[PDB]
Amino acid sequence: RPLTVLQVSLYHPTQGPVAFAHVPQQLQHDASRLLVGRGQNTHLQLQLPQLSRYHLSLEPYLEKGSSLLAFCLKVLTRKSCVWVNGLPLRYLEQVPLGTINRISFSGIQMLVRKEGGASLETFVCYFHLSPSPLI
């Protein structure tokens, strides 16, 4: 596997077509943080008025002794909490991602499945729009 892959599934119970209208099929990202929110300057733009312009970020990094990228999810919104694997995170709090991640925020359900790959400079996300609940 040349790149770490994040398989991302998204769900919203009532606003899918508008909320996900700008979600691409995939994004290949570098070693900078990946921004998620309703703003135009985000990498994953989700068009929900309850989101902040910058709502959360995914940061790739390396632990000492590791040959595989880790990912740190940090909350950027002041408005609400982001549940990550059972922990309700609030502004500027953060946790690392595991292999399967259940993330909910402002009605959006998001699953992130991480498959490790070799690159330490690049990763790719694939986005699936689920008609049915994920969590």
Partner: protein, 139 residues
């Protein structure tokens, strides 16, 4: 509300040649706490740039965050350079290695010496940087 300040005293043995010429000294600069502050050679990628071909286009970044059960602003530092290790006191950060910044610490990368001192403030939405000159080496 008071604002957390990162006071960075910076030194380079060749600084008289203009290494820090784009840095404004002793002037606080305010950033949203959702910003990431980057240091490096490339002015399109970094808020703070050094006039130095030895400096990577992005050398390191400051990542503001909050510990659980804490009301103060912490900062990770992360090395972005593939070629140049970043020393935080005696801890060596390789490429994409990060760590929490102590309240007082010495940063070293190449010939650069930075003394970083964090002064907590009560604002959670903002923080400030401040740069201090040193005519003589810090280390």
């Amino acid at each position: 509300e008071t604002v957390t300040c990162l006071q960075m005293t910076i030194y380079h043995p060749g600084q008289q040649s203009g290494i820090f010429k784009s840095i404004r000294f002793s002037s606080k600069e305010k950033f949203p706490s959702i910003e990431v502050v980057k240091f490096g050679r490339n002015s399109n990628m970094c808020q703070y740039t050094f006039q130095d071909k030895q400096v990577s286009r992005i050398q390191f970044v400051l990542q503001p965050f909050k510990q659980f059960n804490s009301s103060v602003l912490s900062f990770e530092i992360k090395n972005m350079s593939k070629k140049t290790s970043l020393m935080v006191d005696n801890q060596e950060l390789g490429y994409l290695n990060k760590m929490d910044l102590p309240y007082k610490c010495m940063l070293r990368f190449g010939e650069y010496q930075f003394l970083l001192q964090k002064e907590d403030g009560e604002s959670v939405e903002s923080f400030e940087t401040q740069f201090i000159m040193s005519s003589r080496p810090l280390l």
